[PDB]
Amino acid sequence: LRACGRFFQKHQGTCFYFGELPLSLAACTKQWDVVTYLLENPHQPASLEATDSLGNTVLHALVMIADNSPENSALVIHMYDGLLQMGARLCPTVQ
Amino acid sequence: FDRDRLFSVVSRGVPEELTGLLEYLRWNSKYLTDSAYTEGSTGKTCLMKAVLNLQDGVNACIMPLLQIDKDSGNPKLLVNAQCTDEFYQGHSALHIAIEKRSLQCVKLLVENGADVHLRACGRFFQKHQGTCFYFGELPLSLAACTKQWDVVTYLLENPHQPASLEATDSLGNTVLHALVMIADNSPENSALVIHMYDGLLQMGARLCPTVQLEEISNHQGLTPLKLAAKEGKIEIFRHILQREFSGPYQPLSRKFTEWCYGPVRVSLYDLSSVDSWEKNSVLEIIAFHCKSPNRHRMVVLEPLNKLLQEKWDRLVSRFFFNFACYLVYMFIFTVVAYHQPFGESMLLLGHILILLGGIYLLLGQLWYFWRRRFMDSYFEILFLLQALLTVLSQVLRFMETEWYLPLLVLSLVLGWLNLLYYTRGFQHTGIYSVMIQKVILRDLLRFLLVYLVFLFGFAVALVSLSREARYRSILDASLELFKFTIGMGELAFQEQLRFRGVVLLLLLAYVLLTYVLLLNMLIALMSETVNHVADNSWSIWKLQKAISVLEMENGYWWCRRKKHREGRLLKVGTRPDERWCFRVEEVNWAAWEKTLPTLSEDPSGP
Amino acid sequence: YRSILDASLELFKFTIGMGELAFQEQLRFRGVVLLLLLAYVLLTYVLLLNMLIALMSETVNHVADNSWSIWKLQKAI
Amino acid sequence: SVLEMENGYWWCRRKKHREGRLLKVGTRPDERWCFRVEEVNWAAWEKTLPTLSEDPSGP
Ligand SMILES: COc1cc(/C=C/C(=O)N2CCC=CC2=O)cc(OC)c1OC
């Protein structure tokens, strides 16, 4: 479900861009339990190669939120490596 | 019995040694609070002498002394007796019981009807320089300014005496004012003052829940926040400005949260007694009333930096319009000063224009100094003096004086200096200007005094040696000397002078002394450059831009613009509590734990 | 000093070190012109001092790894 | 500079005025000349000390 509102688009002031998707919102808020559940649940697949209106996947949207802060960088690196390892086993064919 | 033996036995603490004291007081019918039992110098009684000499918190002879006073029929109670010397006036035994940090004797003393609202108004207790300790002239204020919190919680909540939180002393200071007054910017003093401030605020939330203790004004007329800003105490002022409380103390907080959404968070700071819409604001008190040297750090804090930046972004068009008006005035001034005796008509119109502009600037600076009756009035006195010189020059022109042309071009030159005032609009030149003034002003003025003294000394020596042939006046000799500084000085071996080697040695010694003088000023400015912190200069630039913002809001002397209020009326809770809250957005990537109440469920833009 | 060109040239010659200031007797306003030249010499001296310690303050607050990185960026372009 | 100004000039030699005051510091009584220094300390609420005088007084 695409959250395409003005609060969610990337611009200056009163915005929070995360990738307009529930998996991207779960990755850009450091959950990894909602992430591992949305990725692996019998009801809904919540694939890793979904894009939003800017064409950004969840890896793009983790790059987009990345500040060069000490804690933001650790968050982004953790979620980047975790989703890479999980895409190695959910959709092992695609890069 | 006598007072000397009583002081001895009450210092020892033995209660058995005062056995016939009640009998002597009955047979003599003399009360214990007379001049025959108080010391002649300071007027302290035997009870004060007892409570001075405490043995691990308790004195054995302090209860019978109160007992045999009740048996003595004293109209004025012994415990309420205070000192009479002007140095120590108003000091009672309750103040000594609090100062010695003993809750046991405090309880034992308030059970016998110790009046807890006893003003210690002596010279030792008033605020001045040297041998003083100001705490607020009250026992609750003394218990708060000495970090007890047990005497405080007992005096506030005991059945005998209420010891209310809204009591004032002779300066009108409550206990919150008196905690602001004692606040140093030390690391431990600030923690002490912040702890007692928050503790007494929370306790006044439940003892007198109706009144707001932050709104009480002293005899000078300041709330404790304005007294924190006026006295230049940075850390307690910062802690009051951004105060967050979680629980039932939420209506006592000043910093609320409106909504959170992941890392994005909007906070709300109430602009009560801060925003410049009211008369005695905190911004105006930091700018035009505070004289402490850290007043430039007070405009840097979190709810104030964003507020002054928003005001500046709204007023920058008016700032540059004032700059453009002054620049156009200086262009017509320099054109009028160039063309000096369609042509004569335009020249008379230009004279009329610069006279009207001088009158305009003169009235503006006069209104400025009428309202505000260095570095704050540094350019204001310059603008005033330049407008004064311009109107005096046009008056002397109308008087057909020959000396009108020196006063005109001086008013021209000074005008082109006053344009430097408009460097504070841009960050780099403004910060650099502030840094330049602080680094170079004192050093350059002292160097100039040295150079002038040495110049005229060597000029008199050069005239005296060059008078007798084998530099005529001090003016021409000092000019020939000063030409060594600009790099056009001429030194040569003269043969028509009798004293010619010593004049050559005098010129060489002056060249060497001027070189060491320039070296002295160079490495003095270099040493000031190395020992320089750029955050200090950035803060002083923010203070300059804040004073510019505060003066642009008033409007001109002809039209006074109505001050548009900042923030929006928001329901922060149920006291409903409707405050004007300035909104500050922030992003925090380390705050995933969310233990907070938020005023609004759904995020919204400004 | 007749035109603004020649007067500004005589003024600017104080910067290069060949400026000539002298007490003139053929000028009515001669003391105030001497005071104007002296005030200009002082103002130019404070201006050069201002630029000197501004560059000195920028030199002290300077990190050479930043300059090395920008040089690597220039060489990379 | 302070030490040389106290001697006075070569023509008149001023008598050196003593600093401090004769105070009883204890029983050795022990009477010394003690220069008085005031201070404020906001971290010393623990009071394990003997004091020479009970009541505060200005200089
Ligand atoms: C009073 O302190 C001084 C400041 C300055 C700064 C000049 C400047 O940066 N300007 C002016 C022209 C407009 C922008 C701009 O960039 C220069 C001074 O030297 C005469 C000052 O006096 C010490």
Swiss-Prot record, chain C:
Coiled-coil intervals, chain numbering: none
Domain of life per record: Eukaryota
Cellular localization per UniProt: Cell membrane; Cytoplasm; Melanosome
Tissue expression as described in the entry: Ubiquitously expressed. Expressed in dorsal root ganglia, trigeminal ganglia, spinal cord (Lissauer's tract, dorsal horn and dorsal columns) (at protein level).
PTM info: N-glycosylated.
Disulfide feature: none
Transmembrane region(s): 33-53
Physiological role: Calcium-permeable, non-selective cation channel with an outward rectification. Seems to be regulated, at least in part, by growth factors, like IGF1, PDGF and morphogenetic neuropeptide/head activator. May transduce physical stimuli in mast cells. Activated by temperatures higher than 52 degrees Celsius; is not activated by vanilloids and acidic pH.
Protein family membership: Belongs to the transient receptor (TC 1.A.4) family. TrpV subfamily. TRPV2 sub-subfamily.
Assembly: Homotetramer. Interacts with a cAMP-dependent protein kinase type II regulatory subunit (PRKAR2A or PRKAR2B) and ACBD3. Interacts with SLC50A1; the interaction probably occurs intracellularly and depends on TRPV2 N-glycosylation.
Name of the featured protein: Transient receptor potential cation channel subfamily V member 2
Organism: Rattus norvegicus
